[PDB]
RNA sequence: UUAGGCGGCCACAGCGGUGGGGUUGCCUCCCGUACCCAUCCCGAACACGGAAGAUAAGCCCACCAGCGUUCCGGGGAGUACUGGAGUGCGCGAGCCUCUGGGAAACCCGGUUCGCCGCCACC
RNA sequence: UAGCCGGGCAGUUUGACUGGGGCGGUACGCGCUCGAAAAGAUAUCGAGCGCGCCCUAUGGCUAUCUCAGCCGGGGACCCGGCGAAGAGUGCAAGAGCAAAAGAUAGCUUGACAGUGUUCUUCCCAACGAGGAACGCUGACGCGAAAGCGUGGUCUAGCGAACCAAUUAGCCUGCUUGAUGCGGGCAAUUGAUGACAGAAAAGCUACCCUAGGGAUAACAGAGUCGUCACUCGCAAGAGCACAUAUCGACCGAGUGGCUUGCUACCUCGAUGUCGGUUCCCUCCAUCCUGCCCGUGCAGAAGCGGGCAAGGGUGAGGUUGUUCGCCU
RNA sequence: AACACCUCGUACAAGAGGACGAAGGACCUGUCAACGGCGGGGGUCUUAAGGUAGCGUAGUACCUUGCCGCAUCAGUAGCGG
RNA sequence: GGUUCCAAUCGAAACAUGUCGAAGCAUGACCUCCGCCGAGGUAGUCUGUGAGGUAGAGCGACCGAUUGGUCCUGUCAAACUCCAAACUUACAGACGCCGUUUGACGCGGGGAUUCCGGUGCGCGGGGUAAGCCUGUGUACCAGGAGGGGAACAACCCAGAGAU
């Protein structure tokens, strides 16, 4: 189904798992990528992907964009390259669907989504000055698979 | 103590000095309390009323200033107790106080105790206090008879600091009569 | 409201804040008020008896005598006058 | 629930507490001579007979207590309000 | 209050810690069961009787802020949110200007190791 | 005259709610959290879930006492320590409680009779039953006493009139007395759950009337989940080569042909489907004109661009639209 | 069931109970060319039995234009299996 | 479905409780009229004394969710809260306005109509959405002319005796 059905924040927070049963599992394989044993401060450059509009991103989109970005970093740096990316959001809002007409219309559980306010960083990668152009490209592919417009922002890096 | 959400008891509860559940039930009468308290060596009796910033004591007596009228014997016993109650009871009648309710604090209501002796004294002093005759010790033990019979089993003199040998419940009688006089300094 | 009992929607107003938990001081439970006196109505979560209907919480009545140890306080609900039976444990002097 | 066959309680007749015996109110027979019995005969004839054509109501899931409290000394009985009980059994 | 009793507010009073103090005075520990009283077993406790001893506990006094709590400064922040108004902007979700209010977390620095009433007493 | 059978015949009933109605369900009487927008009030076939009892102790008072859980010494028992409350308190949920509202023990029957004040039921603001808080009179239980006990810590566990049975006393029945048998003042118990209370099954296409677009089918209209078509990214394969060609995931859209939703327009009628005949139009192009790329030798293709001038036909099954077949 | 009869009740009556007991019913049996029925499971269970000769994609078969064959250039038709 | 002359004053309800009740009624709310009472009243603001847990925030403050690493590191809540507004609300004083020949506030009585509502904005709940369904506060249309907006119930100005 289309994201047009769930992209806006137009419903109350629905995250209490103590009253919601049958919630589908998340498609997000991993949140901590690269070299998780190493530290974030052990890198010269740090670039985050900033969301420009306040929206809702379904776990399907998080997996697709996280996948297509890290897949690039693995292709250009290797399965054990020097870097570490971070998907700093987890899908908490549960989604319904009215799948009778408008009689007894409360929907059944169909998925999960992460709410991101405009200005927040969805992803944050850490790499050396050399790999700085690869992380940018990996993010270019990432903002192509999520609803909002995005700003690729280099936080600690004056080696431009 | 442990954190923000923690509950610390009221001060007089931490100090193990005030039984708040009994205190409330006491205050419900609307009458002033007769605070009967004892110590290892002494006895005490206060007449307390309620006040905006804390209790107001209108009258009181201590087993120490008992001698001030004739005492020359120990003060942590039955005769001492009764007399201290009567004394306090009389100073009370003088302040315009007419009735009271016995407050025994964290003591036990054992039949024939000193708090009851204190209570009988105040009743004898002319105060209207809710009581039960068959819980107060028999007249003789109040006088100090039980103690005379103890030293009757002498062998080794009971009272170290000489007041006598066989002791004197008669001194008690002399003291009671001395207080029942109307002139006496109160 | 899914139901219509007296304790409906009273979770917040009839619950003690953690630090105020436990039995309350006897001083205010034995307080004395005079007729014509202005008093604030507020239930004490810790005191079970002498309570009034929760809707009246927050009012400011006028003492007009008593019925036993409890007090008779006059108030105006909306535009209708009402007489409330309440103990001092749930009352406070105004001003 | 259980209930003691005898116990102390207020006797509204003597006006002082005394031992009462508890019994279950038995149904007194009908003489069939009351006004209602006569109206049935008078008003019943050809066709439908109004109220006298209706049949017995139904049942509540639990009935209240139907008791008689008898004083041990004056020997008179008084009734009280009942309370819903699925079963009542006296002790002794 | 050179050690006491009854309290109000009920952590600014909690948690933890250092130092000081008592011969016939005070409070304790203390000593002891013939009695009043007591233990579903124990004078442990409760209760009664009493001073040979002690200031080591408690208690009272002075004091330390590490944790917890109260308030305050500066910073966060006039930020977040918001009551009134607009032919202001945006495809739209939404935003912005004017007017009146105004936060929490957190960091740094002070504060707080109780205040007050009645009675008795060297 | 009595009992049985008795649609052969007669009179009637066969409820309401509802994104039309039926089926399903009960949001038809009640309690709690959230919805509810920090006073009060507030809907939907709104989300989570309960009550129509149980208990003589699981009620009441008094005395004595302090629980979960963790640690140490001899997942039963014993000793010590830490431990404001996470235990327990009958049952939903939310709230209350630690020298207790919990545990233990002992005693007791206040789960007592009579009559009220007030709030609630029903915010404001009229309305019954029911409910609760707080008094008074009477008699008791426990405690030294203050005091506590008008059932269970608080909010669910409920039922009118008429009639019958029951409790104690008293009034009354036609000129009058005696007896029998009746009528009445107060109150307890017996059910109406459609729960502020009728005694109650269906078919009609043989149909009939009153009305309604206050409400459905059909057409129109709004939407666009579905449907049709497009675009972004480009994993992948394509002997190597992402982009000759095919192209997942995820993301952004356009149309108004299908389908679904809604109930705005019409029920004093806007004639149905399919077909036929005859006229105009759209482009998201099947052919024809002109172009670009190729995994373009040629020939035959495959993919793409501009382009709506013209054309796009005959037949077999089927009412078919659609679709299969020559 | 009513009448009659008996007991209690009432100076009588109302009323309460009893004895006797018709058709009917319980109970048993017969009956389907009487209303109707002839399944699921396994190699018995419901509820009595568990579909025999035949006929069959039927004017009765949803799936369905079922599969094979005839016939036609092509046959959701028609006929045969 | 229809119900026939003129004018002057005031001017709604489309909601709540009960109903074999939902195309109807009764009782309230609200409109109007009459009589009574005789001095205060409170639509606005300020201050004082009280009530409150929504927005926001945060959670080594409970609770339940939700990451990784050898304490540190990544995230949430209609049915969570160590915190916490704007704001709403009880009472009182002060100022303002109002009332004592226009008698307010209040009380008693006669008469209704009304219980299909709609739209804009704010806050909502359901639903992919809707010129959807269902709440709430407010102003408007209904019953509101005249000016503007091409036309156009509710958007802007504006509330209107005649000349
Ligand atoms: Cl003491
Ligand atoms: Cl009330
Ligand atoms: Cl019974
Ligand atoms: Cl106007
Ligand atoms: K029509
Ligand atoms: Mg709330
Ligand atoms: Mg008849
Ligand atoms: Mg020392
Ligand atoms: Mg018929
Ligand atoms: Mg008729
Ligand atoms: Mg209907
Ligand atoms: Mg509210
Ligand atoms: Mg209770
Ligand atoms: Mg009836
Ligand atoms: Mg009966
Ligand atoms: Mg009803
Ligand atoms: Mg009702
Ligand atoms: Mg017709
Ligand atoms: Mg319509
Ligand atoms: Mg026509
Ligand atoms: Mg084209
Ligand atoms: Mg053309
Ligand atoms: Mg065939
Ligand atoms: Mg006219
Ligand atoms: Mg005129
Ligand atoms: Mg929030
Ligand atoms: Mg509000
Ligand atoms: Mg109109
Ligand atoms: Na349905
Ligand atoms: Na995008
Ligand atoms: Na408290
Ligand atoms: Na007749
Ligand atoms: Na035992
Ligand atoms: Na000490
Ligand atoms: Na009916
Ligand atoms: Na009532
Ligand atoms: Na449509
Ligand atoms: Na569209
Ligand atoms: Na017409
Ligand atoms: Na046609
Ligand atoms: Na053309
Ligand atoms: Na054809
Ligand atoms: Na209406
Ligand atoms: Na109605
Ligand atoms: Na009707
Ligand atoms: Na907000
Ligand atoms: Na208007
Ligand atoms: Na115009």
Swiss-Prot record, chain A:
Gene3D superfamilies according to UniProt: Ribosomal protein L10e/L16
GO molecular function: rRNA binding; structural constituent of ribosome; tRNA binding
Keywords for the protein's UniProt record, in alphabetical order: Ribonucleoprotein, Ribosomal protein, RNA-binding, rRNA-binding, tRNA-binding
Disulfide bonds: none
Keyword Ribonucleoprotein: yes
GO CC annotations, alphabetized: ribonucleoprotein complex; ribosome
InterPro entries, sorted: Ribosomal_uL16, Ribosomal_uL16_arc, Ribosomal_uL16_CS_euk_arc, Ribosomal_uL16_dom, Ribosomal_uL16_euk_arch, Ribosomal_uL16_sf
BP GO terms, sorted: translation
Subunit structure: Part of the 50S ribosomal subunit. Weakly binds 5S rRNA. Probably binds the A and P site tRNAs.
Function as written in the Swiss-Prot or TrEMBL entry: This is 1 of 5 proteins that mediate the attachment of the 5S rRNA onto the large ribosomal subunit, stabilizing the orientation of adjacent RNA domains. Modeling places the A and P site tRNAs in close proximity to this protein.
Alphabetized HAMAP family for the sequence: Ribosomal_uL16_arch
Protein name (database record): Large ribosomal subunit protein uL16
Organism, as annotated: Haloarcula marismortui (strain ATCC 43049 / DSM 3752 / JCM 8966 / VKM B-1809)
Curated annotation (Swiss-Prot), chain B:
Single Gene Ontology BP annotation: translation
Domain of life: Archaea
GO MF annotation list: 5S rRNA binding; structural constituent of ribosome
Keyword Zinc: no
Annotated Pfam families: Ribosomal_L5e (PF17144)
Recorded GO CC terms: cytosolic large ribosomal subunit
Sorted UniProt keywords: Ribonucleoprotein, Ribosomal protein, RNA-binding, rRNA-binding
Keyword Ribosomal protein: yes
SUPFAM superfamilies named in the record: Translational machinery components
InterPro entries recorded: Rbsml_uL18_euk
Matches recorded under PANTHER family: LARGE RIBOSOMAL SUBUNIT PROTEIN UL18, RIBOSOMAL PROTEIN L5-RELATED
Function noted in UniProt: This is one of 5 proteins that mediate the attachment of the 5S rRNA onto the large ribosomal subunit, where it forms part of the central protuberance and stabilizes the orientation of adjacent RNA domains.
Subunit structure as annotated in this protein's UniProt entry: Part of the 50S ribosomal subunit. Interacts with proteins L5 and L21e, and attaches the 5S rRNA to the 23S rRNA. Has been cross-linked to L21e.
Similarity comment: Belongs to the universal ribosomal protein uL18 family.
Protein name: Large ribosomal subunit protein uL18
UniProtKB/Swiss-Prot annotation, chain C:
PROSITE patterns, A to Z: RIBOSOMAL_L21E
Organism per entry: Haloarcula marismortui (strain ATCC 43049 / DSM 3752 / JCM 8966 / VKM B-1809) (Halobacterium marismortui)
Alphabetized Pfam families for the sequence: Ribosomal_L21e (PF01157)
GO terms for cellular component: ribonucleoprotein complex; ribosome
Alphabetical keyword list: Ribonucleoprotein, Ribosomal protein, RNA-binding, rRNA-binding
Molecular function GO terms recorded: rRNA binding; structural constituent of ribosome
GO BP, sorted A to Z: translation
Superkingdom of origin organism: Archaea
Summary of the function given for this chain in its UniProt record: This is one of 5 proteins that mediate the attachment of the 5S rRNA onto the large ribosomal subunit, stabilizing the orientation of adjacent RNA domains.
Origin organism lineage: Archaea, Methanobacteriati, Methanobacteriota, Stenosarchaea group, Halobacteria
SUPFAM superfamilies on file: Translation proteins SH3-like domain (SSF50104)
Residue segments, region Disordered: 1-65
The keyword Transmembrane helix belongs to this UniProt entry's keyword annotation: no
Subunit structure: Part of the 50S ribosomal subunit. Interacts with protein L18 and binds the 5S rRNA. Has been cross-linked to L18.
Protein name: Large ribosomal subunit protein eL21
Sequence similarity: Belongs to the eukaryotic ribosomal protein eL21 family.
From Swiss-Prot, chain D:
GO MF terms held by the record: large ribosomal subunit rRNA binding; structural constituent of ribosome; tRNA binding; zinc ion binding
GO CC annotation: ribonucleoprotein complex; ribosome
Cofactor needs: Zn(2+)
InterPro entries for this protein: Ribosomal_eL44, Ribosomal_LSU_eL42, Ribosomal_zn-bd
UniProt keyword Ribonucleoprotein, yes or no: yes
Disordered: region residues: 22-63
Cofactor mode of binding and number, as noted: Binds 1 zinc ion per subunit.
Zinc fingers (C4-type), renumbered ranges: 11-74
A single GO BP: translation
Key words of the record: Metal-binding, Ribonucleoprotein, Ribosomal protein, RNA-binding, rRNA-binding, tRNA-binding, Zinc, Zinc-finger
Record's subunit section: Part of the 50S ribosomal subunit. Interacts weakly with protein L15e. Binds the E site tRNA.
Biological function: Binds to the 23S rRNA. Binds deacetylated tRNA in the E site; when the tRNA binds a stretch of 7 amino acids are displaced to allow binding.
Protein name: Large ribosomal subunit protein eL42
Gene giving rise to this polypeptide: rpl44e
